[PDB]
Amino acid sequence: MRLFGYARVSTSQQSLDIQVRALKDAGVKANRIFTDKASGSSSDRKGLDLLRMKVEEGDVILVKKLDRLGRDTADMILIKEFDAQGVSIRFIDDGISTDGEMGKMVVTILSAVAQAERQ
Amino acid sequence: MRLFGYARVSTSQQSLDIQVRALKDAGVKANRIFTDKRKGLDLLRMKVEEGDVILVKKLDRLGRDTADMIQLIKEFDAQGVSIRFIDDGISTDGEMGKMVVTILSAVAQAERQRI
Amino acid sequence: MRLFGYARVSTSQQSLDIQVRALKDAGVKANRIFTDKASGSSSDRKGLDLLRMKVEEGDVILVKKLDRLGRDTADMIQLIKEFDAQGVSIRFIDDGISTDGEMGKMVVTILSAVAQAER
Amino acid sequence: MRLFGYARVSTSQQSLDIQVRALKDAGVKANRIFTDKASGSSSDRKGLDLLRMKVEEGDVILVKKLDRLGRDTADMIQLIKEFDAQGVSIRFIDDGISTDGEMGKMVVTILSAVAQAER
Amino acid sequence: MRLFGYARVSTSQQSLDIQVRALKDAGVKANRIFTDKASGSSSDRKGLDLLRMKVEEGDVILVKKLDRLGRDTADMILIKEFDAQGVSIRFIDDGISTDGEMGKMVVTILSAVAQAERQ
Amino acid sequence: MRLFGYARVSTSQQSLDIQVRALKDAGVKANRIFTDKRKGLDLLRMKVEEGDVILVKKLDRLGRDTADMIQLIKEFDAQGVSIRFIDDGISTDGEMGKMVVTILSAVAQAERQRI
């Protein structure tokens, strides 16, 4: 298993820095921290793209809070594709993971919310 | 234990009789089905007691916004009352109930940032 | 031929906007501009890494000046040779310099000469 | 075309013999090799001064490397332009570089680019 | 009037340095000191050539001793040509000049010796 | 004052009578002309006295080498004796005499460096 880290902002470098420091403090080496900053460039915006290329089945991505993974709830149900790759996600602040039975609940609930959102 | 039901439409009276039948089908007595088309919800609130279980068809029947949903779930939780969201596979019993609060709190925060 | 854009940038938004605008003014689509923070390690350049995957033989990378490509002359030379080996040439907008074939063969020769004469 | 030779040399005989031999090996007559001590002032370069008087349009000055011509890149560039204005080109034996026309136009462009990127 | 300085060696840099320092100590600015060192190059050997270009009528060349001016006595009777240019020479150590009546004697005597030498 | 003459050939006896006539013509009595074809020079030397003047045709008649010349000129100088080098325009009287020593000393040094 290898730990990766994902941080995301739309605008703020500050919250970028708040997440990246957190990811290191959780134990991710600095070169395994990929970020997305919508106000950057294709590379600042393709941190997830690179991350997809680096992972292997059995690896773990750490993200600070649940809202940092996607633009929206449909967006974050990313969980499916990384689970396709056999790669688990673990949200630090909320202390939930996406693997096994707990990971099944997380998607069930999140689908419910996203379908609600469409209401 | 004691079983209630909550059904809510925006407008369709037709579908209100359709949810109500669905809950009647799940075992809920008709005097225990409360409905809105928010007095229905305010009566059921409440009416319920320790050990009761409320059946709702979907998560989006229960409340206006995820934040309103969290506040409802904690109010029922405090009393020893739980919800089954029939079509969603979700229950507020025990662990799945803690999960649901954890995840909805996180979604709700997003929305206050949206506001 | 598809045009890409590349820039080494410092840590400020100002420094990024300036480089992004310069490459957009040169005709590069916004989704084809890749940057790296100039601060960072040269075995972990995420922008070059993505750019390497997206180019095809015959494509051109535009760069504003020689210093926006490489960390130093030796770094410039190795990158020019890497991309040259993939059939991709580099074009430095402000300096006027290109590396397609002939002039391209001259540029690495002069750059090494300068490598030496400076070293 | 008559071939001349030029070298900046340090203060030792060894340093001079080495540069003189290198230009003789390149085909320059011994009486057409001019040198300046690298120590000295750039508004008093006796060798360049004599060389300037002896060249004709069409002649070529051979130099071993870029650093044997100018005190620095800015000095190299001004000298290349001076001789270029008299119809005389410079040929750097070891580096392979020449300044006759085309490549010559490229060399001052690259050299200034490097002037900048180094400065 | 302007003072110039001329120093000459066949081999020795040391006596070069012994003369140049002398020429400065006599008051010649450093950029008006031209030297010839037979073991140098065309430029090390064309110090007199440059000197001829710099002087004006009325100027003075200082040389340390009389033997430093020419290879031989016929050679040094240089005196004629610099006198053609109206430029006087003054030999420091021997305290003779080549101008006016004293300069006439110097050439008379020196011609006598050189003709003797041919004997 | 008193006038001597010195004439020297390598080999030509003919030219020895030619120099000797030239000095006789310059005013020198025949008992005062010394000749070599180095005893001639040694007699005149080394013979001479204070105030004497020696006439020689050319500078290269006088001596083997410039150094030998300087040594001769100082020996005569010390005694108050002077040389006229007829064909060369040079005299060892006074200033032109100091010049001649100065310049010949410098030429002689060159030659010791040559040796």
XYZ file of C-alpha atoms in Angstrom:
706
model
C 0.000 0.000 0.000
C 1.174 3.534 -0.732
C -0.374 6.756 0.564
C -1.278 9.648 -1.734
C -2.854 12.963 -0.925
C -5.387 15.087 -2.747
C -6.222 18.725 -2.123
C -8.539 20.934 -4.079
C -9.348 24.624 -4.327
C -11.346 26.791 -6.727
C -9.542 30.025 -5.849
C -7.634 29.920 -2.579
C -3.936 29.139 -2.327
C -4.337 29.560 1.440
C -6.708 26.585 1.801
C -4.484 24.811 -0.662
C -1.642 25.319 1.810
C -3.926 24.410 4.678
C -4.725 21.022 3.035
C -1.226 20.221 1.730
C 0.324 20.770 5.156
C -2.419 18.573 6.618
C -1.664 15.824 4.075
C 1.999 15.839 4.978
C 1.109 15.904 8.691
C -0.981 12.795 7.988
C 2.102 11.156 6.455
C 1.897 11.616 2.720
C 5.329 12.374 1.204
C 5.419 15.679 -0.536
C 5.743 14.220 -4.030
C 2.564 12.195 -3.631
C 0.438 15.280 -3.002
C -1.539 16.346 -6.091
C -3.689 19.421 -6.095
C -6.295 21.109 -8.129
C -6.758 24.823 -8.169
C -9.415 25.790 -10.669
C -7.698 29.216 -11.146
C -4.361 27.665 -12.159
C -3.735 25.995 -15.538
C -4.263 22.557 -17.176
C -1.520 21.238 -14.927
C -2.889 22.931 -11.796
C -6.218 21.419 -12.875
C -4.935 17.937 -13.814
C -3.663 16.873 -10.434
C -6.297 14.114 -10.362
C -5.263 12.989 -13.850
C -1.679 12.488 -12.688
C -2.889 10.774 -9.495
C -4.825 8.237 -11.603
C -1.639 7.371 -13.411
C 0.386 6.883 -10.184
C -1.820 4.648 -8.085
C -1.918 0.864 -7.875
C -4.622 -1.326 -6.469
C -4.342 -1.315 -2.696
C -3.196 2.293 -2.380
C -4.925 4.960 -0.305
C -5.683 8.594 -1.141
C -6.002 10.963 1.818
C -8.196 14.007 1.451
C -8.772 16.502 4.272
C -12.560 16.848 4.137
C -15.295 15.259 2.068
C -16.083 18.408 0.127
C -12.559 18.621 -1.193
C -12.853 15.636 -3.477
C -15.446 16.843 -5.991
C -17.085 19.956 -7.407
C -20.490 18.465 -6.405
C -22.061 15.335 -4.908
C -22.569 13.612 -8.270
C -18.944 14.538 -8.946
C -17.707 12.922 -5.764
C -19.707 9.701 -6.161
C -14.534 9.878 -8.425
C -15.208 7.426 -5.605
C -16.552 4.847 -8.064
C -13.683 5.130 -10.473
C -10.968 4.964 -7.834
C -12.802 1.971 -6.403
C -12.755 0.455 -9.867
C -8.947 0.833 -9.650
C -9.036 -0.820 -6.215
C -7.890 2.406 -4.580
C -9.529 3.502 -1.307
C -10.153 7.068 -0.191
C -10.028 8.242 3.371
C -11.360 11.609 4.490
C -9.209 12.850 7.352
C -11.413 15.358 9.234
C -14.640 13.313 8.886
C -12.936 10.055 9.779
C -14.690 7.981 7.124
C -13.100 5.746 4.430
C -14.528 4.423 1.235
C -13.513 0.762 1.538
C -15.477 -2.387 2.348
C -18.872 -2.170 4.049
C -18.391 1.365 5.339
C -17.551 2.342 1.771
C -20.764 0.803 0.575
C -22.749 2.941 3.048
C -20.910 6.092 1.984
C -21.975 5.636 -1.630
C -25.554 4.622 -0.741
C -26.062 7.729 1.391
C -24.265 10.003 -1.090
C -26.387 8.744 -3.991
C -29.491 9.443 -1.913
C -28.317 12.995 -1.315
C -27.387 13.630 -4.956
C -30.756 12.337 -6.139
C -32.324 14.564 -3.491
C -30.239 17.416 -4.883
C -31.841 16.837 -8.292
C -35.030 17.541 -6.347
C -41.553 -0.458 19.078
C -44.254 1.344 17.077
C -44.308 2.277 13.398
C -45.198 5.579 11.701
C -45.046 6.824 8.151
C -44.409 10.153 6.517
C -45.403 11.031 2.956
C -44.927 14.383 1.199
C -45.845 15.705 -2.235
C -45.186 19.105 -3.720
C -48.532 19.015 -5.565
C -49.692 15.585 -6.870
C -52.563 14.362 -4.708
C -52.490 11.181 -6.801
C -48.904 10.350 -5.711
C -49.775 11.216 -2.124
C -52.233 8.284 -2.195
C -49.496 6.299 -3.836
C -46.872 6.881 -1.081
C -49.537 6.389 1.580
C -50.421 3.016 0.101
C -46.717 2.101 -0.072
C -46.337 2.815 3.663
C -49.594 1.030 4.485
C -48.056 -1.837 2.521
C -44.849 -1.663 4.597
C -47.025 -2.306 7.655
C -47.926 1.186 8.834
C -51.483 1.697 10.269
C -53.342 4.528 8.572
C -53.689 6.581 11.763
C -49.887 6.591 11.885
C -49.281 7.941 8.385
C -48.788 11.686 8.381
C -48.711 13.648 5.230
C -47.849 16.974 3.632
C -48.636 18.412 0.211
C -45.642 21.535 7.060
C -48.306 20.490 9.621
C -48.107 16.811 8.780
C -44.441 16.682 9.808
C -45.072 18.807 12.882
C -47.735 16.415 14.171
C -45.596 13.297 13.679
C -42.804 15.148 15.542
C -45.114 15.731 18.532
C -46.527 12.250 18.288
C -43.491 9.962 18.323
C -42.033 8.339 21.427
C -39.034 6.393 22.581
C -38.602 3.202 20.569
C -40.740 4.292 17.631
C -39.621 3.842 14.036
C -40.645 6.194 11.209
C -40.848 4.950 7.619
C -40.187 7.378 4.804
C -40.023 6.488 1.115
C -36.965 8.577 0.173
C -34.492 10.917 1.853
C -35.843 13.920 -0.080
C -39.328 13.418 1.352
C -38.174 14.332 4.828
C -37.000 17.883 4.685
C -36.318 21.110 2.840
C -32.522 21.025 2.847
C -29.758 18.721 4.079
C -29.346 21.051 7.064
C -33.023 20.763 7.894
C -32.622 16.984 7.530
C -29.725 16.870 10.033
C -31.751 18.850 12.589
C -34.691 16.460 12.208
C -32.488 13.356 12.563
C -30.877 14.627 15.771
C -34.203 15.546 17.276
C -35.479 12.009 16.685
C -32.174 10.504 17.727
C -32.285 12.334 21.050
C -35.627 10.618 21.762
C -34.659 7.105 20.768
C -36.650 7.247 17.520
C -35.296 6.015 14.169
C -35.975 6.444 10.498
C -36.015 3.932 7.661
C -35.647 5.447 4.227
C -37.315 2.682 2.325
C -36.263 3.222 -1.274
C -32.738 4.467 -0.387
C -31.536 1.495 1.673
C -30.655 3.821 4.544
C -31.555 3.480 8.201
C -30.730 5.719 11.156
C -30.337 2.715 13.494
C -26.965 2.556 15.222
C -23.859 2.762 13.066
C -25.505 3.478 9.762
C -27.170 6.255 11.723
C -23.870 7.756 12.855
C -22.575 7.512 9.242
C -25.675 9.306 7.946
C -25.150 12.194 10.397
C -21.459 12.393 9.661
C -21.983 12.448 5.909
C -24.983 14.790 5.922
C -23.168 17.259 8.217
C -20.390 17.395 5.640
C -22.808 17.911 2.791
C -24.636 20.577 4.783
C -21.422 22.556 5.328
C -20.911 22.719 1.602
C -24.340 24.267 1.338
C -23.695 26.977 3.939
C -20.639 27.807 1.842
C -23.011 27.843 -1.140
C -25.436 30.214 0.678
C 0.666 20.137 -35.423
C -0.952 21.087 -32.167
C 0.486 23.980 -30.147
C 1.202 23.570 -26.422
C 2.505 26.107 -24.015
C 4.903 25.757 -21.131
C 6.170 28.002 -18.304
C 8.170 27.893 -15.091
C 6.335 30.196 -12.690
C 6.992 31.512 -9.203
C 4.593 31.105 -6.377
C 2.240 34.124 -6.888
C -0.964 34.301 -8.912
C 0.449 37.376 -10.674
C 3.431 35.404 -11.893
C 1.115 32.704 -13.274
C -1.416 34.995 -14.919
C 1.403 36.785 -16.740
C 2.774 33.577 -18.214
C -0.629 32.153 -19.055
C -1.693 35.324 -20.830
C 1.543 35.449 -22.811
C 0.952 31.939 -24.166
C -2.699 32.538 -24.847
C -1.668 35.639 -26.837
C 0.572 33.336 -28.827
C -2.300 31.188 -29.954
C -2.192 28.290 -27.472
C -5.563 26.984 -26.204
C -5.967 27.465 -22.482
C -6.271 23.782 -21.819
C -2.873 23.206 -23.407
C -0.777 25.494 -21.168
C 1.237 23.599 -18.508
C 3.316 25.239 -15.765
C 5.704 24.248 -12.976
C 6.551 26.247 -9.836
C 10.132 27.337 -10.239
C 10.750 26.591 -6.580
C 10.305 22.860 -7.021
C 12.349 19.679 -7.605
C 13.378 18.797 -11.117
C 12.559 15.071 -10.815
C 9.021 16.071 -9.905
C 7.813 18.495 -12.543
C 4.127 17.743 -12.888
C 3.556 20.059 -15.853
C 6.366 18.616 -17.972
C 5.171 15.182 -16.924
C 1.656 15.814 -18.277
C 2.964 17.659 -21.345
C 5.185 14.639 -22.174
C 2.079 12.413 -22.290
C -0.016 14.736 -24.440
C 2.339 15.699 -27.307
C 2.537 13.890 -30.628
C 5.361 13.803 -33.091
C 5.097 17.048 -35.027
C 3.644 19.125 -32.216
C 5.255 22.362 -31.004
C 5.672 23.647 -27.418
C 5.767 27.474 -27.154
C 7.749 28.984 -24.328
C 8.189 32.707 -23.642
C 11.993 32.848 -23.010
C 14.818 30.348 -22.486
C 14.545 30.779 -18.715
C 10.877 29.707 -18.669
C 11.805 26.209 -19.810
C 14.792 24.949 -17.921
C 16.191 25.417 -14.434
C 19.602 26.139 -16.087
C 21.414 25.673 -19.410
C 22.112 22.024 -18.758
C 18.466 21.524 -17.881
C 17.393 23.400 -21.053
C 19.559 21.191 -23.190
C 18.342 17.922 -21.750
C 14.692 18.985 -22.183
C 15.236 20.128 -25.795
C 16.808 16.712 -26.503
C 14.027 14.818 -24.761
C 11.332 16.520 -26.752
C 13.392 16.413 -29.885
C 13.565 12.592 -29.505
C 9.756 12.480 -29.488
C 9.504 14.541 -32.667
C 8.452 17.684 -30.770
C 10.081 21.101 -31.153
C 10.184 24.101 -28.885
C 9.696 27.690 -29.874
C 10.807 30.598 -27.683
C 8.422 33.444 -28.533
C 10.271 36.512 -27.226
C 13.803 35.490 -28.178
C 12.651 34.421 -31.649
C 14.407 31.054 -31.404
C 13.104 27.713 -32.678
C 14.436 24.129 -32.575
C 12.803 22.535 -35.654
C 15.729 20.897 -37.506
C 18.633 23.137 -38.626
C 18.394 26.146 -36.273
C 17.420 23.507 -33.748
C 20.703 21.674 -34.246
C 22.536 24.967 -33.892
C 20.730 25.991 -30.675
C 21.895 22.995 -28.615
C 25.445 23.463 -29.967
C 25.482 27.156 -29.018
C 23.799 26.456 -25.704
C 26.462 23.867 -24.736
C 29.225 26.247 -25.897
C 27.697 28.771 -23.557
C 27.265 26.093 -20.910
C 31.057 25.705 -21.080
C 32.017 29.364 -21.520
C 29.792 30.272 -18.562
C 30.968 27.292 -16.533
C 39.596 34.894 -47.878
C 42.567 35.054 -45.585
C 42.440 33.233 -42.240
C 43.420 35.031 -39.021
C 43.551 33.670 -35.549
C 42.663 35.256 -32.250
C 42.989 34.315 -28.556
C 42.622 35.763 -25.076
C 45.529 34.337 -23.087
C 46.609 34.444 -19.462
C 49.966 35.635 -18.360
C 52.105 32.441 -18.726
C 54.079 31.256 -21.742
C 52.309 27.889 -21.439
C 48.935 29.540 -21.830
C 50.147 31.336 -24.971
C 51.876 28.388 -26.609
C 48.713 26.317 -26.197
C 46.551 28.876 -27.963
C 49.085 29.590 -30.680
C 49.527 25.909 -31.453
C 45.774 25.360 -31.593
C 45.387 28.070 -34.241
C 48.393 26.942 -36.203
C 46.865 23.434 -36.246
C 43.780 25.045 -37.718
C 45.650 26.373 -40.698
C 46.398 29.972 -39.672
C 49.850 31.345 -40.605
C 51.906 32.217 -37.561
C 52.145 35.845 -38.493
C 48.359 36.104 -38.494
C 47.688 34.982 -34.898
C 46.906 37.885 -32.514
C 46.415 37.547 -28.749
C 45.437 39.692 -25.765
C 46.253 39.056 -22.090
C 42.979 38.216 -20.434
C 43.986 40.294 -17.434
C 43.856 43.554 -19.351
C 41.492 46.473 -20.077
C 38.937 46.104 -22.817
C 39.470 49.597 -24.288
C 43.117 48.686 -24.751
C 43.238 45.371 -26.566
C 46.304 45.616 -28.758
C 45.702 42.340 -30.598
C 42.128 43.156 -31.610
C 43.353 46.616 -32.531
C 45.942 45.226 -34.970
C 43.579 42.516 -36.231
C 40.961 45.211 -37.022
C 43.481 46.958 -39.305
C 44.601 43.836 -41.152
C 41.313 42.109 -42.103
C 39.502 42.596 -45.392
C 35.882 42.033 -46.187
C 35.547 38.296 -46.710
C 38.274 37.263 -44.298
C 37.664 34.846 -41.412
C 38.999 34.995 -37.824
C 39.370 31.550 -36.173
C 38.993 31.354 -32.431
C 39.236 28.190 -30.319
C 36.137 28.627 -28.061
C 33.629 31.386 -27.286
C 35.586 32.335 -24.163
C 38.781 33.019 -26.144
C 37.136 35.930 -27.938
C 35.201 38.051 -25.523
C 35.543 39.010 -21.877
C 31.832 38.041 -21.452
C 28.699 37.426 -23.538
C 28.042 41.109 -24.022
C 31.638 41.568 -25.105
C 31.353 38.580 -27.497
C 28.276 40.043 -29.087
C 29.710 43.490 -29.638
C 32.867 42.023 -31.227
C 30.880 39.698 -33.527
C 28.860 42.748 -34.651
C 31.945 44.890 -35.148
C 33.615 42.348 -37.356
C 30.378 41.492 -39.046
C 30.053 45.188 -40.048
C 33.446 44.959 -41.766
C 32.442 41.870 -43.731
C 34.502 39.552 -41.503
C 33.183 36.389 -39.850
C 34.364 34.441 -36.856
C 34.679 30.710 -36.578
C 34.920 28.909 -33.232
C 36.921 25.749 -33.952
C 36.125 23.544 -30.946
C 32.463 24.459 -30.528
C 31.854 24.085 -34.271
C 30.098 27.452 -34.515
C 30.397 29.971 -37.352
C 28.937 33.451 -37.979
C 28.884 33.664 -41.805
C 25.307 34.769 -42.619
C 22.420 32.543 -41.431
C 23.946 30.587 -38.517
C 25.701 33.865 -37.840
C 22.390 35.676 -37.457
C 21.205 32.914 -35.156
C 24.335 32.974 -32.952
C 23.945 36.605 -31.837
C 20.221 35.994 -31.197
C 20.937 32.918 -29.061
C 23.847 34.623 -27.349
C 21.673 37.612 -26.315
C 18.906 35.228 -25.174
C 21.531 33.603 -23.018
C 22.854 37.011 -22.016
C 19.363 37.645 -20.612
C 18.637 34.177 -19.216
C 22.015 34.214 -17.451
C 21.602 37.820 -16.351
C 54.132 66.390 -26.490
C 53.074 62.951 -25.283
C 55.315 60.297 -23.737
C 55.358 56.699 -24.970
C 57.417 53.780 -23.801
C 59.054 50.923 -25.645
C 60.399 47.702 -24.182
C 61.792 44.736 -26.010
C 62.731 41.153 -25.230
C 63.639 38.093 -27.295
C 62.708 35.573 -24.598
C 62.449 37.030 -21.111
C 59.195 38.174 -19.547
C 61.263 39.117 -16.487
C 63.273 41.797 -18.326
C 60.039 42.744 -20.001
C 58.647 43.424 -16.530
C 61.877 45.107 -15.526
C 61.558 47.580 -18.458
C 57.788 48.159 -18.264
C 57.977 49.034 -14.571
C 60.876 51.359 -15.391
C 58.830 53.050 -18.138
C 55.967 53.691 -15.766
C 58.415 54.901 -13.097
C 59.689 57.343 -15.731
C 56.115 58.579 -16.214
C 54.679 56.776 -19.197
C 51.013 55.826 -18.638
C 50.454 52.137 -18.821
C 48.484 52.248 -22.069
C 51.316 53.989 -23.890
C 53.764 51.168 -23.197
C 54.251 48.881 -26.217
C 56.438 45.837 -26.056
C 58.009 43.301 -28.266
C 58.733 39.801 -27.154
C 60.078 37.759 -30.029
C 58.639 34.561 -28.411
C 55.077 35.927 -28.323
C 52.870 36.302 -31.419
C 52.308 38.848 -34.245
C 50.744 41.133 -31.666
C 53.505 40.580 -29.093
C 55.860 41.294 -32.005
C 53.990 44.295 -33.471
C 54.262 46.624 -30.525
C 56.397 48.975 -32.639
C 53.827 48.841 -35.445
C 51.102 50.047 -33.084
C 53.448 52.690 -31.630
C 54.012 54.103 -35.139
C 50.292 54.532 -35.519
C 49.876 56.338 -32.155
C 52.577 58.978 -32.229
C 52.422 62.555 -33.477
C 55.262 64.857 -34.322
C 56.689 66.243 -31.105
C 56.128 63.114 -29.025
C 58.827 61.242 -27.123
C 59.454 57.501 -26.823
C 61.264 56.353 -23.680
C 63.327 53.202 -23.848
C 65.315 51.863 -20.886
C 68.663 51.156 -22.553
C 70.042 51.634 -26.040
C 70.162 47.939 -26.834
C 66.453 47.574 -26.272
C 65.436 49.485 -29.359
C 66.738 47.221 -32.130
C 67.846 43.674 -32.886
C 71.195 45.118 -34.119
C 72.982 48.426 -34.729
C 71.790 48.756 -38.334
C 68.339 47.974 -36.941
C 68.506 50.739 -34.374
C 69.827 53.404 -36.759
C 64.225 52.876 -36.251
C 65.861 56.115 -35.133
C 65.739 57.493 -38.682
C 62.136 56.609 -39.277
C 60.872 57.963 -35.971
C 62.877 61.097 -36.702
C 61.162 61.247 -40.069
C 57.898 61.314 -38.063
C 59.355 64.087 -35.890
C 59.346 61.792 -32.869
C 62.358 61.821 -30.518
C 63.727 58.865 -28.586
C 65.301 59.083 -25.185
C 67.285 56.249 -23.637
C 66.748 56.330 -19.886
C 69.772 54.493 -18.412
C 72.313 55.977 -20.874
C 70.900 59.473 -20.570
C 71.101 60.275 -24.278
C 68.289 61.510 -26.591
C 68.025 61.447 -30.321
C 66.930 65.043 -30.954
C 68.761 68.083 -32.309
C 72.563 68.199 -32.344
C 73.021 65.433 -29.789
C 70.774 63.303 -31.982
C 72.971 64.011 -34.948
C 76.029 62.751 -33.027
C 74.197 59.606 -31.936
C 73.501 58.620 -35.534
C 76.996 59.566 -36.764
C 78.672 57.415 -34.114
C 76.170 54.563 -34.521
C 76.662 54.488 -38.296
C 80.414 54.319 -37.719
C 79.948 51.347 -35.416
C 77.559 49.517 -37.754
C 79.923 49.987 -40.689
C 82.694 48.745 -38.407
C 80.470 45.779 -37.583
C 80.333 44.934 -41.297
C 84.102 44.706 -40.864
C 99.610 70.063 -29.487
C 101.290 67.425 -31.670
C 99.787 65.217 -34.367
C 100.120 61.459 -34.951
C 98.519 59.027 -37.338
C 97.521 55.402 -37.182
C 96.904 53.204 -40.220
C 95.997 49.499 -40.229
C 95.408 46.943 -42.968
C 94.463 43.309 -42.655
C 96.619 42.425 -45.684
C 96.769 45.028 -48.515
C 100.180 46.693 -48.465
C 98.903 48.888 -51.303
C 96.117 50.374 -49.120
C 98.562 50.798 -46.254
C 100.462 53.272 -48.470
C 97.117 54.759 -49.320
C 96.053 55.454 -45.688
C 99.567 56.642 -44.871
C 99.399 59.154 -47.701
C 95.938 60.267 -46.531
C 97.322 60.997 -43.044
C 100.431 62.662 -44.466
C 97.934 64.743 -46.434
C 96.012 65.621 -43.247
C 99.253 67.137 -41.944
C 100.890 64.248 -40.108
C 104.743 63.980 -40.326
C 105.899 60.572 -41.512
C 107.808 59.798 -38.307
C 104.473 60.171 -36.514
C 102.498 57.700 -38.621
C 102.389 54.270 -37.043
C 101.095 51.311 -38.876
C 99.913 47.722 -38.592
C 99.223 45.075 -41.220
C 99.873 44.936 -33.146
C 103.292 46.600 -32.612
C 102.414 49.722 -34.550
C 99.591 50.542 -32.127
C 101.707 49.633 -29.117
C 104.442 52.084 -30.114
C 102.039 54.985 -30.701
C 100.542 54.195 -27.263
C 103.981 54.536 -25.629
C 104.823 57.550 -27.721
C 101.929 59.954 -27.177
C 101.863 62.718 -24.578
C 99.529 65.208 -23.008
C 97.966 67.473 -25.625
C 98.665 65.204 -28.583
C 96.031 64.413 -31.194
C 95.898 61.114 -33.109
C 94.374 60.943 -36.591
C 92.750 57.727 -37.720
C 90.887 57.225 -40.991
C 87.927 55.217 -39.644
C 86.676 53.878 -36.320
C 87.289 50.270 -37.410
C 90.988 50.947 -37.968
C 91.583 51.467 -34.277
C 90.788 48.225 -32.581
C 89.647 44.623 -32.616
C 86.259 45.042 -30.955
C 84.137 47.871 -29.557
C 85.302 46.833 -26.082
C 88.923 47.075 -27.140
C 88.068 50.483 -28.634
C 86.587 51.756 -25.339
C 89.704 50.670 -23.426
C 91.944 52.486 -25.913
C 89.862 55.689 -25.773
C 89.963 55.820 -21.968
C 93.679 55.220 -21.879
C 94.240 58.171 -24.215
C 91.622 60.239 -22.442
C 93.359 59.741 -19.105
C 96.503 61.295 -20.629
C 94.886 64.277 -22.292
C 95.231 62.787 -25.784
C 92.427 62.831 -28.374
C 91.440 61.038 -31.526
C 89.993 62.332 -34.781
C 88.274 59.711 -36.878
C 88.671 61.435 -40.181
C 86.183 59.719 -42.466
C 83.545 59.200 -39.721
C 83.124 62.812 -38.581
C 83.820 61.778 -34.993
C 86.216 63.343 -32.522
C 86.992 62.415 -28.922
C 87.413 66.086 -27.925
C 85.159 67.161 -25.071
C 81.451 66.462 -25.381
C 81.516 64.451 -28.558
C 84.117 62.440 -26.682
C 81.810 61.753 -23.743
C 79.031 60.781 -26.215
C 81.377 58.370 -28.001
C 82.254 56.630 -24.711
C 78.655 56.506 -23.602
C 77.460 55.043 -26.887
C 80.349 52.611 -27.356
C 79.970 51.317 -23.773
C 76.360 50.500 -24.600
C 77.296 48.771 -27.820
C 80.048 46.861 -26.030
C 77.600 45.509 -23.438
C 75.504 44.048 -26.202
C 78.582 42.213 -27.378
C 79.402 40.703 -23.977
C 75.820 39.441 -24.035
C 76.613 38.113 -27.517
C 79.793 36.360 -26.243
